[PDB]
Amino acid sequence: ILPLSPVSRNRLAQVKRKILVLDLDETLIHSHHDGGTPPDFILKVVIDKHPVRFFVHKRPHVDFFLEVVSQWYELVVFTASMEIYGSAVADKLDNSRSILKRRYYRQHCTLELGSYIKDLSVVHSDLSSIVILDNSPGAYRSHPDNAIPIKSWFSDPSDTALLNLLPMLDALRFTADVRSVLSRNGSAKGSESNSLEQAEDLKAFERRLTEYIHCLQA
User: Fold this and answer.
1) Looking at domain 6-29+61-216, what is its CATH homologous superfamily?
2) 23 assigned to active site
C-alpha cells in the first residue's frame, strides 16, 4: 500500500464503504477437468453422483491481488458455476484468510442469450457503492456502469492484468459514486463529467492517482 495523504485519508471517511464483486473462471482462475504447467491445486467434487477432478490454475498474482484489494473493498464472489464447484474453488483461493466468505453462484444468475447475467442488486442495491470485475461482458449486461472489464485468462504466464488494476481500484474507492468513473469507460464533445457531483468524484479519483505518479515517475 502506498501511503495515504491527509486529504485522501479524510476523504475516505466521507464516502461510503464499497463492495468489489469478483468472478472466478477466466477472471482469477482457469480449470480443466479429466479429458504442460502443473496445476496450483486439484479439486475433487461429486456432481450428479459422479466424482470429477478439476485441475485449477491461478491467474498470476491473484493471491497478492486479493490480499491488497481486501483492505479496500468488501469482496464478494459472484460465479456462474454450480455451487459445489464455485464454493470449493473460493475456499482454496481464500486459503484461511477469511476474505472470500461471501459467495453467489449459478442459482443467483439468469441465463439470457447464452449468458449468465449477474444482478448486482442481489449483492447490494446501492449502485453507487458496488463494482464488478468479470471477464464475461454478458455477466454485467444489466449494470454496465458498475463494471471493470478484464481480459479472459487461460494460461498466459506473463499476464499482469490483476497488478495493472490495483492503482485504479485504489483511487476508485475515494469516489462517492463509483459510476462517476466507470460510466465513462456526447461522444463528439470533450466533456469528462456531466455534473458537479461527478466532477468532484473525478477530482478525488485523480488526487489518488497523483500520489501514485509522484512515487513512480521519480
Assistant:
1) HAD superfamily/HAD-like (3.40.50.1000)
2) yes
In the chain, where are the structural domains located? 6-29+61-216
| 19-22 and 41-46 beta bridge pairing | unpaired
Known catalytic residue: 159? no
H-helix or E-strand containing 68? helix 62-69
Question: Resolution for this model in angstroms, one decimal place?
Answer: 1.9
Alpha carbons 167 and 150: distance in angstroms, whole number: 15
Experimental technique of record: X-ray
Q: Which residues pair with 19 in a beta bridge?
A: 74, 130
- Residue type for position 175: T
